[PDB]
Amino acid sequence: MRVVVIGAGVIGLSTALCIHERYHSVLQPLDIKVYADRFTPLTTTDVAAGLWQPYLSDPNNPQEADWSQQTFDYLLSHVHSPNAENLGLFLISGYNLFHEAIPDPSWKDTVLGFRKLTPRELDMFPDYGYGWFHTSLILEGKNYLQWLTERLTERGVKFFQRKVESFEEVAREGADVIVNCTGVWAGALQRDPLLQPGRGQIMKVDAPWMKHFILTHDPERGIYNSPYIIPGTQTVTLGGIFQLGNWSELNNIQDHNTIWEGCCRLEPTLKNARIIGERTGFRPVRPQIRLEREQLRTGPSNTEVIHNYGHGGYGLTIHWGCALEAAKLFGRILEEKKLS
Amino acid sequence: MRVVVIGAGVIGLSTALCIHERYHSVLQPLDIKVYADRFTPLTTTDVAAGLWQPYLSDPNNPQEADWSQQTFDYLLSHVHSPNAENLGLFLISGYNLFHEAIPDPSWKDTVLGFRKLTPRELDMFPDYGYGWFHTSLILEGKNYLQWLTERLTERGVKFFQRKVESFEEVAREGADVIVNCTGVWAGALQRDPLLQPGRGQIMKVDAPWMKHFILTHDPERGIYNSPYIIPGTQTVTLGGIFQLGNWSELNNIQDHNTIWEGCCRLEPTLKNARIIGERTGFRPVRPQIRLEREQLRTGPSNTEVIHNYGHGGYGLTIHWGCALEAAKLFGRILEEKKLS
Ligand SMILES: Cc1cc2nc3c(=O)[nH]c(=O)nc-3n(C[C@H](O)[C@H](O)[C@H](O)COP(=O)(O)OP(=O)(O)OC[C@H]3O[C@@H](n4cnc5c(N)ncnc54)[C@H](O)[C@@H]3O)c2cc1C
Ligand SMILES: Cc1cc2nc3c(=O)[nH]c(=O)nc-3n(C[C@H](O)[C@H](O)[C@H](O)COP(=O)(O)OP(=O)(O)OC[C@H]3O[C@@H](n4cnc5c(N)ncnc54)[C@H](O)[C@@H]3O)c2cc1C
Ligand SMILES: O=C(O)c1csc(Cl)c1
Ligand SMILES: O=C(O)c1csc(Cl)c1
């Protein structure tokens, strides 16, 4: 059983690890290989701040709400483990500001100590008059991806830097199961009109006095098109750009100005914070995560393919639930091959 | 009117600043000088982490409860000012862990978003089964003291490195009002059996993933004789020593081992944190702050004194309320001398 996972993002690496950990003993000819065009720190996961928060609206597939929750419970179960520093995982509390009262989220009980903001807290933010306060977790992509890489290397999963042109080229080379974790670039292997790039731009700033995240929201401009401030381990992430259909992997000046003055008005202590870096990424936007199987008509034989892409701006938030679910789909392929 | 403030800690400097801004134009020859044996970074204020939190019990003088709220309200009114970085001031949420249920503190409504810990939050700390969660402030003494100095220097308040032997010495030099802010060393100028050193020791550790403060409590050990973890701007403070009657300004190895084992058990991610420094300070312990006027019998005519010391382990928590109050008693001196 030769398995080829395409993608070295949080989706591909966690899926490869979760498949190996659940199926190493039931299948000894289990050679897992990871094909990827870019690795850390050159993936979309590296650009993400790493905060655990799903979208405010319910996810159009209630199974995604569970995948988000079991990812949170799994990460929280190791947030006080001594290796949490290596994963880039830690607790963080913060605010979610609004201009008008909105209903509570579906993940209010997943989060620790969810509550609505008191008047004295709202007075620190004059432009907003309603919001939440809650304790969540941050999984920084740079540390988490390298942690997954080393653990996959411990389990004998070889890595190869190459751009896959088609599923058939991997199938014809001997692959039995192809795990499609290509993210926003998935359409290049199979056209999907529902998948489109949600381009974002973030600023990484040195402001170590920031102990809380601050996410603002405006339904007119869309989600994450509003200033947000997310403190990480060594730096503070400033963002607020979300552009559909923009393929320009290049830092914009106007977006830089939008991010800066939006967060500076939100928190005036940032005016003296030095800018360390700035990055551009593409959220794999889709109305639904494509986590499903597909038997490919490739050749006289037929290839088995597992898709998992289209996680939008919540990939790290939902990655572990998607990895477990992709491992279950891998097990059904096993039972149908007279193999489990 | 020649005023002499003895003490360059948070109590001496804030009182000298609060006195001048209220009386520099009501009083034309207002020459204020600061006499101090040690300045920053060699004062007890520099050892403190800077967390705003009073004792758990009522302060035996309900005016101190007001002084603490005045300090919180004033600091909170400057937490989003762009010069808060110069003050070393920023918001921070955190935990207060207990082994079983105890009554709520009197300052519950002063802090932001006070609440009790949920069961899932208590599961992250296996030893403690009850606790609180609230948002507070941190005023790092080093940045705050150098800020107060720069203010006072701009206003013609000259500083002098000098050990004061007696009030009579200062009054001999021509001083009209003496503001005694000598902290734990006040007994060397007037014997006070109520003032004793609450020696403490803290560890400054590099663990920037710590976003919350964690204070543990044990009624058997006494307050602050239990592990606490207070993340600062550039470092994380680890403490938990409160020893009455020890004047040894020397870091102890057993106290070091007590702090390390207590905080590492409380937070296993601290196992690999770099130790940056270690400090020892003396809390000016008193059953109540001595904030009062005293006309003492030196020379053929009196020279009046204002005492401000005995703040224990909540000096930065209460400094501003005591500074305003010491300015009021300075104003009554102006009335008794018919100067206003
Ligand atoms: C600015 C910004 C901030 C974000 N913040 C958060 C956040 O705070 N929390 C959160 O949960 N999410 C956040 N996200 C979203 C998150 O980054 C993504 O959902 C997540 O990274 C998706 O990763 P992925 O594994 O699907 O693909 P990405 O990590 O891009 O990885 C794609 C992988 O597929 C590979 N690949 C693609 N095509 C081929 C090919 N043809 N041949 C070989 N390899 C190929 C790529 O090279 C790479 O290996 C943010 C996104 C952006 C843009
Ligand atoms: C380990 C530790 C942690 C702490 N943490 C906190 C905390 O988190 N939050 C909080 O609110 N408080 C905390 N405290 C308490 C806080 O540090 C003190 O309450 C506060 O610093 C009081 O300082 P002060 O101004 O009274 O005098 P200190 O800063 O000592 O300053 C005394 C000044 O008076 C001078 N002086 C004394 N005698 C003479 C003299 N005879 N002649 C000339 N000058 C003299 C001293 O040299 C110095 O200039 C902590 C204390 C310790 C020890
Ligand atoms: O996509 C984003 O910009 C984003 C900000 S917080 C979060 Cl979770 C995701
Ligand atoms: O005295 C202390 O060690 C102390 C710890 S938190 C706080 Cl406020 C004071």
Calculate how close chain B gets to A89, using CA atoms only, in Å: 8
CATH number of the domain encompassing residue A178: 3.40.50.720
Strands B213-216 and B89-98: parallel
A6 Cα: distance to centroid of ligand 1 (angstroms): 12
Shortest CA distance from A270: residue in chain B: B82
Contact indicator for B94, B136 with CB cutoff of 8 Å: yes
Between chain A and chain B, the number of residue pairs with CB atoms below 8 A apart is 90
Shared domain check, B210 and B116: yes
How is residue A258 written in tokens?
Answer: 């939008």
Residues A15 and A67 in one domain: yes
Instruction: Render A182-201 in DSSP notation, one character per residue.
Output: -GGGGGGTS--TT-EEEEEE
Indicate whether B329 and B206 sit together in one domain: no
Neighbours of A57 (CB within 10 A): 12
- Contact at 8 Å (CB) between B298 and B167? yes
Q: Indicate whether A20 and A84 sit together in one domain.
A: yes
B219 touches A: beta carbon within 8 Å: no
Q: Which two tokens stand for residue A250?
A: 């290049």
Strand partners of residue A5: A34, A179
**Domain stop point among B243, B266, B285:** B285
Pairwise CB contact (< 8 Å): A92 & B211: yes
- Whether residue B328 sits in one domain with residue B309: yes
Q: Report the alpha-carbon distance of residue B178 to residue A227 in Å, rounded.
A: 51
B211 touches chain A (CB under 8 A): yes
DSSP string over B189-230: TS--TT-EEEEEEEEEEE-TT--SEEEE--TTT-TT-S-EEE
Task: Find the A117 Cα to ligand 4 centroid distance in Å.
Answer: 27
Resolution (Å units): 2.6
CA distance A52 to A49: 9
Under 8 Å CB-to-CB from B253, ≥6 apart: which residues? none
Smallest CA–CA distance, residue B119 to chain A, in Å, is 9
What range defines the domain where residue A267 resides?
89-139+196-285
How far does A220 lie from chain B, in Å, by closest CA?
Answer: 27
With beta carbons less than 8 A apart as the criterion, state whether A318 and A311 touch: yes
- Furthest-apart CA atoms within chain B: distance in Å: 69
Closest by Cβ to A91, choosing from B88, B91, B211: B211
Domain identity same for B101 and B22: no
Whether B77 and B148 map to the same domain: the answer is: yes
Q: Which of A51, A60, A123, A118 is nearest to A89 (CA)?
A: A51
Chain B 40-99, residues with CB within 8 Å of chain A CB atoms: 76, 79-82, 84-85, 88, 90-93
Phi, psi of A101 (to 5 degrees): -60, 130
Structure tokens at A274: 């030095």
Q: Using an 8 Å Cβ cutoff, are B206 and B269 in contact?
A: no
- CA–centroid distance, B88 to ligand 4, in Å, is 17
Q: Is the CB of B240 under 6 A from ligand 4?
A: no
Q: What angle do CA A9, A13, A18 make, to 5 degrees?
A: 145
Cis peptide before B268 (omega within 30 of 0): no
Chain centre distance of CA B58 = 17
SS3 assignment for A279-292: EEEEEEECCCCEEE
Which residues from B are below 8 Å from A132, CB to CB? Answer: none
CA of B214 to the centre of ligand 1 (A): 34
The radius of gyration of chain B from alpha carbons, rounded to an integer in Å, stands at: 20
Task: Give A90's contacts in chain B (Cβ within 8 Å).
Answer: 209-211, 269
Q: Are residues A170 and A281 in the same domain?
A: no
Chain A residue numbers touching B265 (CB-CB < 8 A): none
Residue B268, chain A, CB below 8 Å: the answer is yes
Please give the C-alpha separations between residue B194 and each of A49, A297, B182, in angstroms, as whole numbers: 52, 89, 15
User: Minimal Cα–Cα distance from A4 to chain B, Å?
Assistant: 35
Would you say A53 is a known binding-site residue? yes
Nearest CA among B316, B280, B312 for reference residue B197? B312
Kind plus residue range of the DSSP H or E element containing A225: none
Note whether B153 and B221 are same-domain residues. no
Q: Does A80 contact B268 at a Cβ distance shorter than 8 Å?
A: yes
Q: Which residues of A touch B272 (CB under 8 A)?
A: 82, 85
Q: Is the peptide bond before A41 cis (omega within 30 degrees of 0)?
A: yes
Contact call for residues B94 and B213 (beta carbons, < 8 A): yes
Specify whether B218 is located in the same domain as B318.
Answer: no
**What distance in Å separates the CA atoms of residue B315 and residue B181, rounded to the nearest whole number?**
11
Q: Are residues A329 and A201 in the same domain?
A: no
Is residue A53 lining ligand 3, measured as CB closer than 6 Å? yes
Using the 3D structure, point to which of A285, A303, A321 is the last residue of a domain.
Answer: A285
Q: Would you state the structure tokens that stand for residue A4, as one six-digit string?
A: 């080829």
DSSP secondary structure code for residue B124 in this structure: T
d(C-alpha A159, C-alpha A316), whole Å: 21
C-alpha–C-alpha distance, residues A6 and A8, integer Å: 7
Burial string for A220-251 (b: 16+ CB within 10 Å, else e) reads eeebbbbbbbbbbbebbbbbbbbbeebeeeee
All residues at 6 or more sequence positions from A138 whose CB lies less than 8 Å from its CB, including other chains:
A49, A50, A51, A52, A88, A89, A90, A92, A230, A232
Determine contact, residues A289/A310, Cβ cutoff 8 Å: yes
Ligand 2 atom closest to the CA of B311, numbered from 1:
19
Q: How far apart are CA B177 and CA B188, in angstroms?
A: 19
A228 lines ligand 3 (CB under 6 A): yes
User: Which of B84, B93, B118 has its CB closest to that of A93?
Assistant: B93
- Take residue A59 and report the two structure tokens written for it: 């996810």
A85·B210 Cβ contact <8 A: no
CB atoms within 10 A of CB B175: 22
Same-domain status, B165 and B101: no
CA distance A321 to A245: 27
Chain A CB within 8 Å of residue B119 CB: no
A332 bridge partner residues: none
Indicate the helix (H) or strand (E) that contains A121. helix A119-122
Pocket test for ligand 2, best of B5, B18, B44, B291 (most atoms within 8 A of CB): B44
Q: What domain count does chain B have? A: 2
The CATH number of the domain holding residue A279 is 3.30.9.10
Q: How far apart are CA B320 and CA B324, in angstroms?
A: 6
The alpha carbon of residue B83 is apart from the nearest alpha carbon of chain A, in Å, by: 7
Pairing of strands B196-206, B243-244: antiparallel
Say which residues have a Cβ less than 8 Å from residue B193's Cβ, sequence separation at least 6. none
CA A338 to CA B65: how far, in whole Å? 74
Evaluate whether B29 touches B23 at the Cβ level (below 8 Å): no
